[PDB]
């Protein structure tokens, strides 16, 4: 979708939140990105993808 502007610092945030326990604001941007770096290489799921 070439969204060079929907800076992803976005998705990670929500993600973590949805599994309460983690104090989101109280966790840096770093780790977060690295988190994407790994997610990227992950296969979607037939449902989702389809």
């Amino acid at each position: 979708l070439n969204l060079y502007q929907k800076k992803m610092k976005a998705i990670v945030e929500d993600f973590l939140k949805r599994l309460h326990i983690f104090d989101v604001a109280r966790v840096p941007d770093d780790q977060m990105y690295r988190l994407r770096d790994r997610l990227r290489l992950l296969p979607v799921e037939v449902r989702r993808l389809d």
Partner: protein, 50 residues
Amino acid sequence: QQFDFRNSMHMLTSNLTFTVYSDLLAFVSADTVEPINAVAFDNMRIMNEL
């Protein structure tokens, strides 16, 4: 020195009507892309960790 008209009468070569400008530059109209879109010699994109 005695005074001899003839020899003291000279003609005058002068240009006509200028207009002198300083500062210069100013005449330059210039804007800027939005920061989120930079590039170096690279041309791929400076600052590119979305």
